[PDB]
What does this fold into?
Amino acid sequence: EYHIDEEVGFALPNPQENLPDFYNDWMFIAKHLPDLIESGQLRERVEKLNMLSIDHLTDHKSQRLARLVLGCITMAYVWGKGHGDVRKVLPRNIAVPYCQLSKKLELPPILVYADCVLANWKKKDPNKPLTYENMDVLFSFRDGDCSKGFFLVSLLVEIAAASAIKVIPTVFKAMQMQERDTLLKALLEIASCLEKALQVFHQIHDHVNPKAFFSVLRIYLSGWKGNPQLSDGLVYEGFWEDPKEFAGGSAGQSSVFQCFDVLLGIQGGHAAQFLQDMRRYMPPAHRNFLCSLESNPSVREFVLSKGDAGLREAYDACVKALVSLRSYHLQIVTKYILIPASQTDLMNFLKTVRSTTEKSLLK
Amino acid sequence: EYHIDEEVGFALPNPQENLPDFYNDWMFIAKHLPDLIESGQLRERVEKLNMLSIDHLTDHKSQRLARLVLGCITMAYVWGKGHGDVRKVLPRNIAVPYCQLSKKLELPPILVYADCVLANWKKKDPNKPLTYENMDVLFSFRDGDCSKGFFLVSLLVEIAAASAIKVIPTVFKAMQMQERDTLLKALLEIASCLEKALQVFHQIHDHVNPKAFFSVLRIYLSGWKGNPQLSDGLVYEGFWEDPKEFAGGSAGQSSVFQCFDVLLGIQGGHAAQFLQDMRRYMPPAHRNFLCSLESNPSVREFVLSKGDAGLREAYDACVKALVSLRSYHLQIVTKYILIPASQDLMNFLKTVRSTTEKSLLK
Ligand SMILES: CCCOc1c(CCC)cc(-c2ccccc2-c2nnn[nH]2)cc1NC(=O)Nc1ccc(C)cc1
Ligand SMILES: CCCOc1c(CCC)cc(-c2ccccc2-c2nnn[nH]2)cc1NC(=O)Nc1ccc(C)cc1
It folds into this structure.
């Protein structure tokens, strides 16, 4: 019901690769961003684009592909080469269909995790499994940006954590039937799956370069909420008369991070409001899921009420798995953002969320 | 999409009054609770009842009516006359269908606000409006329990607050189009509607007696979560082998209270977990609505960013309206619970009222 595949999880299973003949002009630009950004012929091709109606995007996978197409074009139109020459107005020809499509899918008109990671992938050979070697991305921004490395390693973590999500029904079924051994194995499988997701995340070092990420890709994943370059926001010509502020990319847009926090009862001020705001950037069905988990019986309260050492240890195994992921996430933010920048605000938020996870330990 | 009527709001519009011929034995008992409890024939009628399948309850209104029927019978079977003679096991021929129906509707197998208030009403004359004089309840527990007074005055507050809910789309539409004057009128209409709901709540004194409420009705609205009488819970024979703990009645089961807290950005520990637990006791469509409001742009953050005195004052008008309702609620809990008892719930209400007071801007 909440669009969560057993294998792929929150990611879009088998994303669509081609749009109908009607949107060939949109597809041409998005597929040639590395060439158009470098030559500078991008903004002219976006400005000389005719206004296409979103009526031919009938199914969810085509609507999601068109959002990925328009989203990547919008970030390339706004940032350009990334040397201060920025655009504060998105042309009517592209801003009104992108906002109509974003309204239909209940997502903000900005490139989001659901678009550039969850719907931006394919299998090279459909016979082989979901491994980096047998996978590729549909869209990139520049040659050498490490977008194949960044988006695929992010996606591989989502697929690794999807194994823990399919265990969630078993957790609540065991609490209803008072099956201690069934509940204990379920909590251990969630912990084992979250530990395996950390090992998958180690592959970032193999396929992403810190200099290329910080000074090339990171520009195209940046938004216009609190950014001094677009202090007031971006004007979506034809749709809104005032500039609108929408946030850029962040690990908080992944529903997997917030999924196990809500499952384990891990509930301050500036950090709490930011994570609640990040749900607006997730697909509507995934927010309805994160919220249905909140209204399910508390796993934390049940384990504490039983006064069982085994269940308390198995609960702390899942908590320690989340702190290990957030600690290693901070280590990667140091390598890919702090070190290249000095050649900070994000770290404080991550340190705060990690301390709240550590405080949720029972032992 | 979230089952919120424009006129009646979260309440069930036009609740069904009769069940199919198949459930006449269930209906007979529920409609005669005052007679069967007083004579003591109730438990014998529940125990000599045959097991009826819930397959003939096809539509939502019939399923909700059957949950109100079985819910009132279950509270009467558990508590009885209310003099310590309590039942710790609900018979298989009523516990299984009630749990099957509760699972289908995604509600706990215990009498809940959605049942005894939202689906427990009718219009005497369909031509006249929704006023206490033109309304009545479908089920009562005892003669003189003031259930018509308690459930109808609770419902009339829900209908009064429903006028504020229909302006919620206007609040978000104004924020998206930067219309300061339409947003200010919208916040003032929410405040005016929540102030009118407080005036409709004053009618409780006219139709409910403190002694009758505390020593008669209150026992049938009590549950088995933390209750020393059913320390372990209630055994739903045939459905679960272990006793289960489900909470009784409270104002927290109303979605209207949490609706405007989420709309205005009003969020400690024991109080926060209790309100999140009370969502489980609300209908599934209503808890999905309270959660969709959380993922909408913050009204509190907008009024603060604009730095406008008018919007700040109109926001505080809605906050002060919530503070007035919670202060008058505490005031009624003193009259109908604290005074009759001397012849804990207060701490929770004082805590949730201080959090509302703290969210004022001025
Ligand atoms: C559970 C999956 C989370 O995935 C991420 C992880 C994994 C952590 C367990 C790490 C990082 C990261 C890596 C290097 C440097 C910095 C960051 C970083 N983490 N926060 N902020 N910056 C990033 C993400 N995701 C992300 O950037 N998505 C996104 C991308 C593009 C758009 C438009 C929207 C969302
Ligand atoms: C939408 C309005 C809120 O409704 C209530 C208000 C209005 C306050 C604005 C007051 C009271 C109250 C009155 C007298 C003495 C005590 C209480 C009391 N307040 N907390 N707990 N007891 C009660 C409720 N509601 C309620 O009892 N519902 C319920 C009833 C039965 C079952 C099975 C489930 C839920």
